[PDB]
């Protein structure tokens, strides 16, 4: 499969999540994603084919994971935007007020701005601390997907938000949305990963 930020993948033939970013760990190929998407050794599938397994994750506390893929997968330095792509150029962290977009299998590519950092989400499983909040909308299934600036600086992977009864926060005003992401930096250093860039 061609690995691109934003596409759908399933875990153990049950749950759906979105790919965050293509990365390498030495000769091993992988993608970073949300920790709540799977447990260590869960099987990831893209378009019905096995592409790898969860190699590590932390959730709750943090919300991160990496999937090590088989050699046959093609890593790309890109994030889906409809039919087009946003190129990954690096991981400079943007500041409060910066514009940012996210990509995932349920709402597609949405943009907004960062509104706060170091936020705590009280999920049913336990608190997740240190998330950055943006007001781009997101829906059930967008978790794990990419958060990136239009300039290509990868910011993190989607964790959660204040979804309404329709499964997203897109039908409420941006001023009222809380869409949260886990910062990418600590995930790369924690797992010794390198981002694929172009």
């Amino acid at each position: 499969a061609n690995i691109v930020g934003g596409i759908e993948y399933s875990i153990n033939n049950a749950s759906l999540c979105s790919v965050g970013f293509s990365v390498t760990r030495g000769a091993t190929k992988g993608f970073v994603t949300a920790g709540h998407c799977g447990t260590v050794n869960a099987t990831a599938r893209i378009g019905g084919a096995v592409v790898g397994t969860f190699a590590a994750r932390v959730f709750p506390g943090n919300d991160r994971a990496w999937v090590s893929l088989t050699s046959a997968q093609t890593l790309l330095p890109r994030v889906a935007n409809g039919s087009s792509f946003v190129t990954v150029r690096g991981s400079t962290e943007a500041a409060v007020g910066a514009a940012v977009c996210r990509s995932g299998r349920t709402t597609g590519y949405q943009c907004g701005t960062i509104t706060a950092k170091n936020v705590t989400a009280n999920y049913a499983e336990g608190a997740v601390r240190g998330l950055t909040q943006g007001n781009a909308c997101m829906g059930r299934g967008d978790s794990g997907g990419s958060w990136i600036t239009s300039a290509g600086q990868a910011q993190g992977v989607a964790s959660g938000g204040n979804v309404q009864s329709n499964g997203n926060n897109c039908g409420i005003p941006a001023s009222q949305r809380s869409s949260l992401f886990e910062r990418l930096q600590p995930i790369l250093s924690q797992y010794g990963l390198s981002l694929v860039t172009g």
């Binding site: 989400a121 049913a124 997740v128 978790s143 964790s159 979804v163």
Partner: peptide, 4 residues
């Protein structure tokens, strides 16, 4: 908030 909920995870996703």
């Amino acid at each position: 908030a909920a995870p996703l």
